[PDB]
Design a protein around this ligand. Structure first.
Ligand SMILES: NC(=O)c1ccc[n+]([C@@H]2O[C@H](COP(=O)([O-])OP(=O)(O)OC[C@H]3O[C@@H](n4cnc5c(N)ncnc54)[C@H](OP(=O)(O)O)[C@@H]3O)[C@@H](O)[C@H]2O)c1
Ligand SMILES: NC(=O)c1ccc[n+]([C@@H]2O[C@H](COP(=O)([O-])OP(=O)(O)OC[C@H]3O[C@@H](n4cnc5c(N)ncnc54)[C@H](OP(=O)(O)O)[C@@H]3O)[C@@H](O)[C@H]2O)c1
Ligand SMILES: NC(=O)c1ccc[n+]([C@@H]2O[C@H](COP(=O)([O-])OP(=O)(O)OC[C@H]3O[C@@H](n4cnc5c(N)ncnc54)[C@H](OP(=O)(O)O)[C@@H]3O)[C@@H](O)[C@H]2O)c1
Lengths: 476, 476, 476, 476
């Protein structure tokens, strides 16, 4: 026997709904991954119909002629309820319509909050007042931003926690669903070869990279209020750091894994400005098309903006495993490439017998693009003398990340979602730096659209212990 | 200023000379790797000329039309001296002819002894008596067999050492010149990633393999007096064990490396018969051609022979690094493939959190064929659940071994040559077992030409701690 | 400015109150360790006065003539309220009397529950209804037993947690306040010398001992319903195991330490009967006085009792640090001595060069009696030959445990108190074994009053890997 | 059956003979430690008799009335032969007298060379010409100095090795016979607790100390030609370093142990002057008696002498175990105390949770005086808060060193004697510094008789990584 589920999309008229949520639920229904009795209920202020949602989402549905019957079966279970986000009568009508569905009283209710955070308090409070199922479970999906600093995020989290349990709150982060990011735990904890070296005695530095080759591309005003740190560092690179640095969990249960992640975060001190390099991209006169416009060339960006589109920060995990190992978090927009990557550079071999010709070993876990795991190491040069040369061992070798995250919410797996204590630790790490940046308005270092970013970032990486050589040559 | 060298080939009328030594010296001269003033002097009882040696060796010379001028310049420096191996007048004529060469008194003398060991004592004694240079160095190349047990090898080694210093004796082993075998030291000692796990705390077992797909192929009588242990185990697999197990040398000087090798050998106890599996191949009735003949089907093999063409022995290195780790030496003829390989199987990960789905990590160093280094490890299965699957990191990417060994003798590098103490340790490890085999004449386990050998070998490997799974699937 | 405190002793007419709680609070007041404004309020059904409590407790007060003025100042702040444990009017009178005290509305209320657990639900529920301070904090001290199995303890813990937060509940364990037990964390985590060896690669087995030289001594009927496992193993030895085995906490905050303890407990599987040895002491005919009576010789013990007065169980911590290391928990009554002790026996040295003369190293942390830390190790025998002999490095060198525990409740430090999740993990480890014991009624192995207990316990320790030698000689 | 032995003392008229060698052989004969058939033969230019040797040595014999019969039995086996050290007739008479003894042709001959090194070449050459036994073994005991630099020591060693095998040469060092020095190997290699931490990952620095509280005390002229480095550092502290730093030998055979020692020495680079602090003691005006005279106050010391009576040098063992760990060698005369000591200071604990209150662990092996092994570590302060305090684990608990060294020469054990390669490595480490000192004549830093020496030595120790605290309080 299988229970019925109601997927309540609140804010279904928004861009996020039609472009990502409705197509994702459609793909999950197409492959039979959803529970059989799944009803999708929209909820927004705009007066639309299921026909309107179909019309605005089918270009993103990737709907091919073959499964048109399944398409019209999908919107058969779809429905819409118009109402306001702070009007109790609208929530009463929403609850009645959910109860008007087949087996709507014992159904599991999954609320996806595709709304700006400005209405999150009211939406969550009203959902807890009137739209909570008395038999099935009730889980809410919350989207970023989760506040802008420690205080505002703490306010929002305390409000949501005052109504919902931690097992009901799913703060969705699309990177925690990516294949390499989830493979990190198997790589670290299923293998003997990576166990004894994964510590400060063998690792010189850890580099976590998130590069984008495109700038703000028109919507620079929305980016201006947050900046690169809040946008990327505070969530993506910090989750990456937690996965890289965490102790082995007692089990693969979500609670144990998130316990280990928050335990790592609690061992990190607040970031100091001397360990931070900020940059803001400028236009490329030799660039072609969109690369010629700088961050300030966007009309929506306020004039004189000091918002950083690039950041390189050094964190330290002050515990037994990691003491003294710099964790370099590097992210930026309008850079030379797209790349999300974990790099461990190992210490020199103690007692070198090859006359300083050896290079530091490196383990690279490239999350994207073209997922790869390779370790740069030394091998004998084919020849006559005893000279090592750099080589590498390369790892050789379905629903996407968002689909699997939604499936996880369906199955109640919370390992790939940000816990409240994890969020608060993340905000406390970066809040003094964010306040200093907002207060002093330091001028970011300009860098040209399509470059690697400020050179001061490379200087900072070199200063904290990373050594780039440039002698490693690789051919596919 | 460069010194002149005399390459004295004694036994130049033999098969080894014409088929390997003369072509190798030819190839070294062709590429200008030899010293400019190098004279090759043959010496044997048969009355031949340089024309005869050219005629019998040119099919093996791989002489192409282009370098015929260099060919005739090569035999210009060639010469021959007929004489007996125990006649002092013949050695006087050899010395006079060497002195009759240009700068023949201050030349470096390199004596390759391409003779059966039965005359080694007389040849070395006479060389030391009359043909030793008073200005340049004198180095002798000695070929296997180096005795048949501890006592005979000790006799021969004591006689040679009574006349020559260790820096003058080059016991040539063609496997110590192979690329992967020499890459073992760089792989172990130039890389941080292989350092902390290369010990008993992480390695469950070490497997050293030497397989040949062909049998004795006609000359079974010569093999009958030695057997597979003396043929392969006592030198090839034992050198492989020394390279795998040795501590890091103080430097890359030959003396330090061979010191580490003999230090490893001294920590090995004598082999017991319960850790030995012996086999002798039989014919394959479904085989095609030469595979249908068994070891005893060779007319040159004495009837009722119990000579083993296969052996699997377990050794233990009783020291701090390796205590309790079984070293499985596996070699055999007429097997299913050609392969020389080093396999390290690592222990299970302690505190498994993946519900016993993990497989033991393995590091494989395949010396031949198709040199490869790969490590079998666990990675997340592309899917939805948290299941690891077996994968592997693969290493991705000139004069041959004999040429480089001869070049090493020219440059005086002795690290790829068996030292006397190393030879004596090797013989003391295996001599009780060899005496037991010769005394009791145990019947070897038959196995069909072209198979993997006796099943008792797999039982022994499983008993000492190796676990084969068969679930690892690999595709190129 | 310092807040006022009310120490509410409920069940003040009981033996525990007059013999331990009132004297402990008296000694804390004598040395000025309590807050200056501290009022002690008794509460029980028996109609007594402060004079009666003084009369029944002064023999235990250790009151010397010098501080009689402080004695009569102490009972000046003392008061008593008679009432029933489930009568709301009595709790109203208690609350009014607390409010009738000076600054009784903003005072911090500390409820020591010196009552049998049968009334704990009613007492806690009524305290939460009516006697909870609205300004100061409210903390309750709960005494053992904390249930009798997983189910009943879970019932009681869920009821208490339904009214009080974890930061308000103090489950008091007098052993967590002992000096060596608290020194375990400093010894493990403040010292480099004990860090790298505190793992499965170096430790062969861990022995946790709790021996008493006296039997049930008259009150055998009370012991009969619980047994040695519930009495000692489930709390004392398990807390000792958690301290020995835990990972390093993120900090010395109580929450981090108890998180590490519960993380250790979660990695322990349920005990199997084959890893359990049970004993029940019999009388000693050669004993003198009380040693001649067996466990069943007590008239209060039901006839045919199979209650175990001795237990030796082996636990395993299935995690990365401890996998395969047996944890031997050994406790018993009427044994040959009093002793609480932690013993780590280390593995043999790998690659022994002293011809098997070496003994396993041992680290001993004796909690009581005569607190000591010593490590048994090998030293050269004073003589001529190269023979090691066993020696040892000995560690060389205030309010008692209950006083410091009560002070901890005053300061709000919860590190030495059992958390709810820790309690439920402890109960789930032992509950199947306890149910099997109460169901099958296995006959315990008799052992004579004053001996070391059953020999089967020594057999079990030897079987799981501990090796006793008896060659270690020590003189003071 | 036991062989006869001849103890030939050459230079028997010297102070060393009568004061140390004759009494030591007397004590060995008194306790029956020598072989039963042992004959002591003196040899010197001065014309003395056995009565004269008895008269000049009995005050040092410690001869008590009880064993006067054994005394006169001892000189019954004593004899003397007068002769010159370069006259062949004298050695012929010595050989004839040895043959004139009972079983003097098959006796084992033990030559103690109690002569200044100026005659060593002649004495050894003549002994090898005429006084070598043809049946028994022949071993020579050689005393320091073993040259003054690399070249002179190499000359002397090449001369002695040209006549004697390494198994015949016993370069006696009285410190290698001391109890703690020999206990170093058992402490390091018989114990698990000292194994995994004995490396660069755990040890911050190694301090080797040799302090004397007395100056040159009259014979300053003899000290002037050598200095403190040659006197103490080049042998005592370097042997101590080898024992501390060496890898585990394959066995306790002398050859394996000395192989490990020379392997350590080969990994040490030549000392640089910036890692050297030199001092020369001056008189103490507040001193009493001999402490008031400085090094230059000795009339036998040449005026303007720059000879160092104190030295503190830092060495580095560039290998896998020790890379980057400073080895501080500290020795000096006229200091505040007598002390020979090995101190290992360990690194800070990684991830400190005790708010920087922890001190570095230390392992101290005091060779003399009052042999002790103790480890300074952190323990909980008896009190209320979580503060560690420094404490220590103390180790708690026959022929002397020279007697056991002579016995070792009798039994042929060479582990406590300097091998030739070890001597040459020791000289090559210090020779550039010694030549620089002799060439530039740097002025040593004055320090007062009875102090700890120059403060620059403490500055150097602090600079290379040792941290002295002064907060460690110890009471017996
Ligand atoms: N390619 C190979 O066959 C090969 C491979 C690996 C190792 N080896 C080793 O290298 C050595 C060279 O042997 P080989 O292959 O050259 O065999 P071989 O051809 O029989 O010996 C070479 C020459 O030695 C002389 N000779 C043969 N038997 C003799 C005897 N009883 N007394 C004195 N002289 C004798 C002969 O020259 P004269 O008649 O002119 O005197 C013969 O031409 C062997 O010990 C073998 O174990 C050989
Ligand atoms: N020293 C110790 O004995 C000791 C040691 C360790 C742990 N503990 C634990 O601490 C708790 C305190 O027990 P205790 O030693 O004080 O025993 P107790 O003296 O029998 O109990 C204390 C008081 O509780 C009241 N009481 C007793 N039985 C009751 C019942 N059935 N219903 C309601 N009230 C009852 C009585 O006061 P009124 O008659 O005035 O109501 C009695 O004076 C126990 O649960 C025990 O397990 C005690
Ligand atoms: N106790 C110590 O003094 C002591 C301590 C440690 C090491 N050592 C070392 O042990 C060796 C023994 O020296 P020692 O203390 O015995 O000094 P020593 O008494 O001067 O020398 C011993 C004997 O050697 C002979 N001799 C002295 N100078 C000579 C010369 N220039 N040429 C030939 N023969 C000479 C003398 O005997 P004849 O006059 O009869 O020939 C003298 O009695 C020394 O090299 C010293 O470095 C000595």
């Amino acid at each position: 026997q299988s229970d019925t589920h109601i997927f309540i999309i609140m804010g279904a008229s928004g861009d996020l709904a039609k472009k990502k949520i409705y197509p994702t639920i459609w793909w999950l229904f197409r492959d039979g991954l959803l529970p059989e009795n799944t009803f999708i209920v929209g909820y927004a202020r705009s007066r639309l119909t299921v026909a309107d949602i179909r019309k605005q989402s089918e270009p993103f549905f990737k709907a091919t002629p073959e499964e048109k019957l399944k398409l019209e079966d999908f919107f058969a279970r779809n429905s819409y309820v118009a109402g306001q986000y702070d009007d109790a009568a609208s929530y009463q009508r929403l609850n009645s319509h959910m109860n008007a569905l087949h087996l709507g009283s014992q159904a599991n209710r999954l609320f996806y909050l595709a709304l700006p955070p400005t209405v999150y308090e009211a939406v969550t409070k009203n959902i807890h007042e009137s739209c909570m199922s008395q038999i099935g479970w009730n889980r809410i999906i919350v989207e970023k931003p989760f506040g802008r600093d420690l205080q505002s995020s703490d306010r929002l989290s305390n409000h949501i926690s005052s109504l919902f349990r931690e097992d009901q709150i799913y703060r969705i982060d699309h990177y925690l669903g990516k294949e390499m990011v989830q493979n990190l735990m198997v790589l670290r904890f299923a293998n003997r070869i990576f166990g004894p070296i994964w510590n400060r005695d063998n690792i010189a530095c850890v580099i976590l990279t998130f590069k984008e080759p495109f700038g703000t591309e028109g919507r620079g005003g929305y980016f201006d209020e947050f900046g690169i740190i809040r946008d990327v560092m505070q969530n993506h690179l910090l989750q990456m750091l937690c996965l890289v640095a965490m102790e082995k969990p007692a089990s693969t249960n979500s609670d144990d894994v998130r316990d280990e992640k928050v335990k790592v975060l609690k061992c990190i001190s607040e970031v100091q400005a001397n360990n931070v390099v900020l940059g803001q991209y400028v236009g490329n006169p030799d660039g072609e098309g969109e690369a010629t416009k700088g961050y300030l060339d966007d009309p929506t960006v306020p004039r004189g903006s000091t918002t950083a589109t690039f950041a390189a920060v050094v964190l330290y995990v002050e515990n037994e495993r990691w003491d003294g190992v710099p964790f370099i978090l590097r992210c930026g927009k309008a850079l030379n490439e797209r790349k999300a990557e974990v790099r461990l550079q190992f210490h020199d071999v103690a007692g070198d017998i090859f006359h300083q010709q050896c290079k530091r070993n490196e383990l690279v876990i490239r999350v994207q693009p073209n997922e790869a795991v390779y370790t740069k190491m030394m091998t004998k040069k084919p020849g006559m003398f005893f000279n090592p040369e750099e080589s590498e061992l390369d790892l050789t070798y379905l629903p996407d990340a968002y689909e699997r995250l939604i499936l996880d919410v369906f199955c109640g797996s919370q390992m790939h979602f940000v816990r409240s204590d994890e969020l608060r630790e993340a905000w406390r790490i970066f809040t003094p730096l964010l306040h200093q940046i907002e207060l002093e308005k330091p001028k970011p270092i300009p860098y040209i659209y399509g470059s690697r970013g400020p050179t001061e970032a490379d200087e900072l990486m070199k200063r904290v212990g990373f050594q780039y050589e440039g002698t490693y040559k690789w051919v596919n």
